[PDB]
Every structure is written in structure tokens, then in C-alpha cells.
Amino acid sequence: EEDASQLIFPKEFETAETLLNSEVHMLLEHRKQQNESAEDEQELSEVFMKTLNYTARFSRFKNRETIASVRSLLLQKKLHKFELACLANLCPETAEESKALIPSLEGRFEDEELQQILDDIQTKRS
Amino acid sequence: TDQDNEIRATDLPERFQLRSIPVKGAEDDELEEEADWIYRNAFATPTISLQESCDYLDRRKGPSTIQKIKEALGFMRNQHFEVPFIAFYRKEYVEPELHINDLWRVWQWDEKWTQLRIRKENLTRLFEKMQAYQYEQISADPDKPLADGIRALDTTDMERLKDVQSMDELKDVYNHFLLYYGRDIPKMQNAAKASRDMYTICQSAGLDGLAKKFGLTPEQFGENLRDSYQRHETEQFPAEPLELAKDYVCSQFPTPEAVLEGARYMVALQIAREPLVRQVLRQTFQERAKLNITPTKKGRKDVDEAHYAYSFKYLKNKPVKELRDDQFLKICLAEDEGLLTTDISIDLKGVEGYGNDQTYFEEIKQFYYRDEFSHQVQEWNRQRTMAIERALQQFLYVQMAKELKNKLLAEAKEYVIKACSRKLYNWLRVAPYRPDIRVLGIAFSSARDHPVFCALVNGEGEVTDFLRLPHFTKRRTAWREEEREKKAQDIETLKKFLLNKKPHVVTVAGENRDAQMLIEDVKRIVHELDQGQQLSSIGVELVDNELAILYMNSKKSEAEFRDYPPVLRQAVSLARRIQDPLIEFAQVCSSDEDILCLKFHPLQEHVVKEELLNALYCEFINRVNEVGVDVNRAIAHPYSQALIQYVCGLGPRKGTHLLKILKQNNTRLESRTQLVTMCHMGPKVFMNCAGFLKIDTASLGDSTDSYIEVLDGSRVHPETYEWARKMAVDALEYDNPAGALEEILENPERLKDLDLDAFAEELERQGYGDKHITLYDIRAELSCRYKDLRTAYRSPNTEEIFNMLTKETPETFYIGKLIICNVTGIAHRGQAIGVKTRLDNGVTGFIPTKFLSDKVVKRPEERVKVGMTVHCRIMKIDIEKFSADLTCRTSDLMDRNNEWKLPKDTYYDFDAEAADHKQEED
Amino acid sequence: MFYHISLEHEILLHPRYFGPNLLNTVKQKLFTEVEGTCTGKYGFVIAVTTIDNIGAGVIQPGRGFVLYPVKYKAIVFRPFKGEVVDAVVTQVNKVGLFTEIGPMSCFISRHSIPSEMEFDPNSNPPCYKTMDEDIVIQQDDEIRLKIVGTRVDKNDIFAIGSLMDDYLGLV
């Protein structure tokens, strides 16, 4: 009974901090680099390969500088981690599109500043 | 289900109805377009990779085949004639360019044309709807010029869609259409209904207007690429790229460099999506593409000499044209397992300094360049250079390389399917055994304790008696006395059985090398009977038991012979197979995909199952129709009923229904006419299958009060019965129709006196077309009714016997291969010559004393013992004696000089291989 | 949805490894243990980033082994009902579409597809299409789907998705 429509989440997502697809891609590729140097190592699971390919293909941001800049930008606004991560990973192109994608977003913040934040996300992409 | 009832009633070939895309009539114009399209894409289009012609019926084609293809299309599309009917009764229209197998290719490619035609129709509607909706804005305000973001969907785009000849070109048109009009279609849908990514960012920001100032349109640049020169001169603009960039600067693109960066993407993407650019590059990749392979960490240790990817472990600058047969499939399979990584590129890798090493990007850089030294031109030239650089590497190189790999992979899979078809055709082409019939099939198991079961089948393949020999596998020369006594008793038991039953031929399963020992025992027993002339000579044959094994496993054998053990059941199949391989193969291979259980090709499992299955069943249809099917024999012998489904124009459903009516009426198929009067067969279905169904008129006898047509037991189609009667009348030089036909069959020698050349004109004069081929076929049938065209049975040769018993092939058993053998003794001639070994496949190996070790060997006794396992390398192979010379020297195993290892690829990257293991040592 | 959470796991150690490299074999076993697993409470576990601390292991009487409580920070991918995510089409047939979100696989039912889409068995690549053919989804396409259900199978949760809402389609 936990979803974005209600935002009534467990004590665990209350404690943990969410990550974006580009950060997860960076972390997984770093892990892959460390694993490859390892010798006589139970190789990485095929599931990890599939997840890595998925994360790399849909990575909206390409460098750690861009990721840090986006993180600071979104950290400035008063946004919960779940909405922040969902907007950053999907990256809606229009304010109406984001309103439709995340119902929780509508009715919370004004749309002129949402258009501004969305355009900032677009400009962050490279 | 009700679908089967509809198919049973419909007067169309069952396979035609079962086709995914329903067969529809084709107009003359459509036939002409389809015939040319089929010929270009199916017979006149060489494969990129090296593929040898699989055609085996012939005992390439020019434009003349287009007319033949059109004739074949008309017979199928309009007249609903199946491929077997056309190849057997419409030869004059399709031959000699088109054969039965080629007609299948046309039939297969006929389906491809229809789907491509349908897609073009759908895209045409979409283009028209966009063309109309876009015009709505112009209609309201014609004065206002179209915005730079609103391209004109002119007839050039529409005609380009009409000129599409392939799916790949269709996608280019569709992708090009979406790039410019993809955004507005959802608005188009609402307007039509009511009336009844990174690209879009640059459009909203207005960078599209800037994108038009770079010098050329995507279509213009594509023309330059096509002609390989500056067909269109780039238009220069006064202001520098940065000066125009600041004009488009906004919140989305603050810096001028970002403005140019965003604009540059539009040019690169637009160039990539241009179908003309895509078409030109698509041709370029097919001409200069090269394959590079580098093993992964996993493959660096997994790909040893015995691995199937050893030959292409390292590849450097190997043109795709060099790939042959299923070489690419193995490369893809190795990649699928993570053993290596592939790369398709049009530029040489690590070949710096080679003459004319400029990459494809450099060659076309001058096709979008302005030759001026002005500073502004250089900036614009620099801006132009990066856009194409992005266009090639980011989009065109990636898409085209992927497209080529799919094209290359499909060709490799097609070869594998072609190989599978060849194997099945050879098995089905073997004619029934003809003694120089009653068959005694003998089968045995690899285990020593297992007995030997002999199954006797009469002429119709019905089991009449069987023999069990508990100790037939034992050697009559065994030193132990009881074994000889046990072996001796079984010999006489078979001797008495042979004397009474008098089988015409004895077939022994080629389970293993022990089959040879059984052959000698059976032959010796027959020799004793023939020595005293108490019994005629009985043929002894060795038959592969792969099909027999499948029947032993198949649950169908259980129903037929519940009490017969598996070894005895396979004995029946071996005896049945020699009697008629086609019947056995069809009966053994049921609708449960049991055919795939047979080993056609090593990589037959890596190809499309539906494509492989369709090709295999085509061989059955071709062979079954050629041989013919006897309905009366099937009714009396249910096991032979599996041939009716393969009959032309019947299929599994109608074929099963045909037996049901005949068995329901408790009558026989006395004449072909009964298929319509009694079985209620449609005229179209009758046309396809009437000539391929045989009735044994002589077997009917006087019990059949109704009229019996002698021609019903011949390939002559009912439509040409009057022609056959006329031919018989002319042969005897009469001056009745039922008398000459009967007499000529008894003495057909008078047929040669006929002048069939003259008879052709008379038919042509009265409007029957060219029938010279048909007339010759009619004359041949009169000489011999339903003469078997299958290849005469012959005993397996030495090469086949070695493969049959050892289950080994040259690819898997070759000189220099590393094998494992067990020592069984020391070869003597005190004095010794080497060590004798036995392989797991039954081959007896021999290790000479000199090859027994790197250093000199004094006595072989201490080096190896009986039962010891020694790793050895094959030096020579003696298939005739199932012997092979072996060496176990440590230096030989190491093979530092690579003398024993299999040949590597011509473009093998030895430099990469040397470096890889060199870094490993460090 | 990918997540970064700290979890705890107790690893048992045979006395064979009570040597200088004990702490290393502890983390090696943790990595081999947790990585690749899936759980309903925490979803898939993608990778182990760091190890916060290794508690003092305990000697279990009679048994030779020693147990260590290893608190560790890991990446987990947990989907939710009513969540819009990107997915990759991997196989397309007449019954419907099959997509993948990271490790998870999804199947889109006909009732989750907009009425404009219609099944087409005649096409060579089976696909979902409408008469206008404005949007075409085929194998390897990127789609945006709404998760409608969660079902846990053999310690492997599988989800069913949907694209029935507005603006969910190939972009």
C-alpha cells in the first residue's frame, strides 16, 4: 500500500536516500571496473549485466560534474526525495507532462517555477 | 475447432489457407511489379557474405526468369495452384529457369511482397493525412509563410514513399517523416477525428532557423554523397556562427557556444535521418565493412584450440565479404556467450601509415565544405565539420553497423537451414531396396549383457515374426569355452529362422563398431545356406539406426507394439526403413515436431525454428508428390497414412478427412473420379491432388463392378486422359479408345514411333498452349506407370560406415586433435612396437614407441599400463580399419610451433594475441 | 525504482579462515551472499557499495563456526504500484508486449493498452499499432509504463505494467 499517489512509505525509505539513474550507472560501472581487475573472482551475475546495460542506455547525465550540479539544483527546492528522483530520472519535457506523470506534483508547487526547474533539467542534459 | 471444418470444406489448397497472409488474386500490373521485385531481391541479389549455391535439383538466371516468376505467381495467386502442381504439370510455364525448389522461393518471396505492399499503403494514408492537416494552417492564413519548423510535405516525400523497394528503405522514409512531422501527428489525430527526445528542444528554442544557415539542406548534402562531389555548393553567410548564435541565445541556450552546440545537433540528426544519406551509406557499409574481434577476459581462457571460436579468436580488418557459410553465426554465438566482442566498421583499425588510409568521414568532409580562407568561412567550416562528425559516429555508423550485422547473421542462419534441407532430401531420395519384400531387421544395444532382437516384416511392413538371440553379441572366437557354446547356439537358431522365413534382406543397426562383427556372423550364416544351395542369397546391409532410435523413443511405437521391448521395436523400424525410407521418415516424423530431434546440422538449434521447419517439410512435399501416394494402401495399412498430408493441395486436415469418408463407406478409392462423386472434393483441390494420387487398378480386380480407368495408375493428370488415349490410338496406327490404351501399355515399344512434335502444334492450333513437355511425360507414363524416380539403394561406403559406427565427422575427428584414449595392451611383433589404445568411439589407437615420450624409451611397460588413460594427439586416421596413429609426447602436446593446431583465420590478429598473453605473464 | 539503503547480514565462518585474511574473507562472503538476491521487503539488491562495520563475531558452542553481523550499504531496485518508469521492449507478440525494467520483467495486457492500439498478427514483426500509426512499438523500443501489480515468485518479485494513461508511449 505504498505508492507515489499516496506517498505513505515505510520507515526504510524514510531512513534511506534515493539515487538517480545516472548516479547508479556511475556507481555500477565503477564496481564493474573494480571487479574486472579482480582475478579468480566469481564473475558478475548476468542480472547485473542486464541492469548495467539498462542504466547506461537511459542515463540522462553523462559526467559526475553534471550529476553534482543537478543534485545541488534539486536540493535547493523543498522537494521530497521520491518526487526529486522520479523527475530527474524520467526528465519530463513539459510541465503538463510532469503533472500527468507524477500526480503528487500537481497542487503542490506553482507551474511557472515548475517550468523553470524543468527547463533547468533540460539545460543540464548535454 | 470450427476452423478445421471450414478448411475441410473450402475448395483451396490447405497450405494456401493456412498461410498467415491470405492469398489474393493479383492483377497483371501487380504481377509484373511483384515478379520484377521478387527476381531482384530473391535471385539477382548476391549475398554480402560468401554463400555457395545450395541448388541440388540441377543435374544464376537472367531477366528471362522474370516472366517465369510471373507465370508462377499467376498460377498461385490467381489459379490457386500449389508449388508441386506447377512444378509437375505446368513445367512449360516455369521451366527451365524455375524448378520446384525455386518455385518455393518465389512462393516464399510472394508473401514478402504482399506485406511490403500493405505497409506502403498504410504509410501513404499517414502521409496524406499529414499533408492535409498541415495544409489546414496554410488554408486559413495562406499569406503567412510557413515557419522554419514546418517543413513542406511535398509530393517528393510522397513519391519517395511510393519508390520504396525494401523494408530498410521504408524505415528511412518513416524515420525521416517522424523527425519533422512526428510531433504534430497527435494534433493531426484529434483534428481528423473531430472533423470526421533531444530533437524537440532545438525546435522549441528556434535553433531550426539557425540550422538552415549552415550551408546545405539534408537532401542537398545527400546528393553530394551520392555523386561523390560538390554537386551543390554550400551557401556562405556573412555573420560568423557565434554572431548568429547570440541572436538565438535564451534561457535554454545561454552561451553562444551552447546555441551552436544545440544547432549542430539538428544538422547532424537531420543529415542522419535523410533517406538519401541513409541509402548512400547503406551501400557504402556493404562494400567496405570490416569485422574486428577481441576476446573478453572470459574468452581469453575459455577459447582453447578445441573451441569453435578458436579460428576467429582474434580478427583484425576482416571484410564482411570474406565471411563464408555460417562463420558469422559462430562469431555471434561466441559473442552471445561473452567470449568475444565484435565491431563492424568501414575504416581500418591499427593500420596507420597505409596508403589511402583516410576514413570515410574525411572523404566526404569536402562534400559539405567551403573552399575559402576567410575567417568566417573557417568558423562555419569548423561548425559544418562537427555536425557531420556527429552525424556519422553517433547515428549513421551505429545504425548501419547494426543493420549489417542482422543482414550478415540472417545469411549465416539461412545457410544452416539450407544444410538441414540438403540432409533431409538425401534421406528421402533413397529408393526401395531391390534384391539382386521380406526384411529381417536386427538391432542390438551397446551393452554386453543386452540381447539381440530380430524383427521380420512382410512386403507391406507388417511384423510377422521375431527372433531373440541372448548371446549373439558374444564372439564365436572367444577363448572361454562357454561363450563359444553360448554364441554357437544362437547362430543355429538364426540359421533355422532364416531357412524357413527366407527374408530377402537382413538389416543390422549401425549402433557401434560391434555392428561389423554381427554383419560377419549374419553373412557367414547366409553363406552356409548358399554354399549348399538350400537357400538363395540373402542380402546383408548396414543401416543407420538414428531414425530407428527415434521410433523406439516415440510413443507411437508403444501403441503399435505394447509388448515389444525397445530393442525389438527399433528392429521393426530398421526393416521398415529399407523397404521404404520415405514412408518410415514420414511415419516416424509426426506433427509433434519429432523431426527436429534428428541431427540435421550442429547449429540447427540456433536458427529460426519456423524457417527451418518450413524448409524441411518442403522436401517431404516435393518427394511425396514425386513418388505419389496410394490411398488404398494407406487404408489397409494405417502406418502409411502419414503420406497423404504431404500430398499437393490436401494437407493434414483434408487428408485425414479423405480417409474418414472412405473408411466410413467401407469402400476403396477405385478411381480418381470417386474423389469428387463420393468424397465431395472441390474442383480446385482435385486439380492439385488428382495427378499425385495413385490407385492400383490391377489390385482391384473384377470385384470392382464400376468402370476402372487404367490411366488412374499413372502420373497423367485426368485433364489429359483424352490426350493419353489419343496418343495410344496413334501408336497402333488405328484407322476404340479403351482398346489401344490397354494394348499400348502391354507393348509400349510402339510409342517411340510416335511423332510427338507434330501433335504439339495441333493442341496449340486449337488453343491449348505449349505442351511438348507434357506430351513427353504422358508417353513416359505409358511406357512405365508411376516409375520410381528415386535413387537406387546402395550399401554405405567406407566413409559413411566410419561415421555411422564411430559417430564422428572430419570436423570433429581430424589429424592433430587432442583426444583421450585408454591403453588396452602393448603391440607386439619381448620385442614391442608401441602401445595399443581404444577410443571412446570404438577407434583403436596406436602410439609408436618413439612418439611415446620426449626422451628415449627403453621398455614401454613402465611408461603405461593396461587401462591407463594417456592424452594423445591424432597423427593419422584410418577410417577403413577404425585405427588412428597417436602421439603422447609432452612437446607434441605443447605444440609451441602450432603445427598440430587447426588453421586460424586469415585476418587473425596475431599482434593482439601476442600482447594479450604477454601482459598476462607480467 | 532504484534505492540506496543500509542492510544487515550475518555471515558464518568456518574455522578454516581464522587466519590473517579473516576480515577480507568476511567481506568476500558478504559480497557473494547478498549480491544478486531479491526480497519482497527490500526488493532486488543490485550491488553492495560499502561495509559500514563488522561486529565482533561470536563462537557458537559445539559448532566450529563463528558468526559475524555485517551491516552493509547496498543498491536496491524496488518498483511500486502506480509508478511510471522507463522500460525496454524485449519480445513482442500477439498476446501483448514484454518489457524489462532493470532486472524486473513486465508484460502489458490488452486491457492496459489504449483502445486505439490493436493486435496485428499479419505483421512480420508483431507489434501494437493504431490505424493512424502515429506511434509504433516494436522490440528494443523505449516505453514509459505504469506499474499495476507486484507478485513475488521464488524470492523474485515480478511486476505487471501499464501504458493506458496519457503521455505514456514511445517518445
Swiss-Prot record, chain B:
GO molecular function: DNA binding; histone binding; nucleosome binding; RNA binding
Keywords of this entry: Acetylation, Chaperone, Host-virus interaction, mRNA processing, mRNA splicing, mRNA transport, Nucleus, Phosphoprotein, Transcription, Transport
Chain positions covered by the region annotation Interaction with PAAF1: 1-574
Predominant subcellular localization, coarse grouping: nucleus
Keyword hit for Transport: yes
Disulfide bonds: none
Domain S1 motif: 830-889
Tissue specificity field: Ubiquitously expressed.
GO cellular component: nucleoplasm; transcription elongation factor complex
Record keyword Transport present: yes
Subunit structure: Interacts with RNA polymerase II and the DRB sensitivity-inducing factor complex (DSIF complex), which is composed of SUPT5H and SUPT4H1. Interacts with KDM6A. Interacts (via SH2 domain) with SETD1A. Interacts (via SH2 domain) with POLR2A phosphorylated at 'Ser-2'. Interacts with IWS1, AICDA and PAAF1. Interacts with histone H2B and H3. Interacts with WDR43.
Recorded family membership: Belongs to the SPT6 family.
Protein name: Transcription elongation factor SPT6
Organism: Homo sapiens (Human)
UniProt gene name: SUPT6H
Residues of the full protein shown: 283 to 1315 of 1726
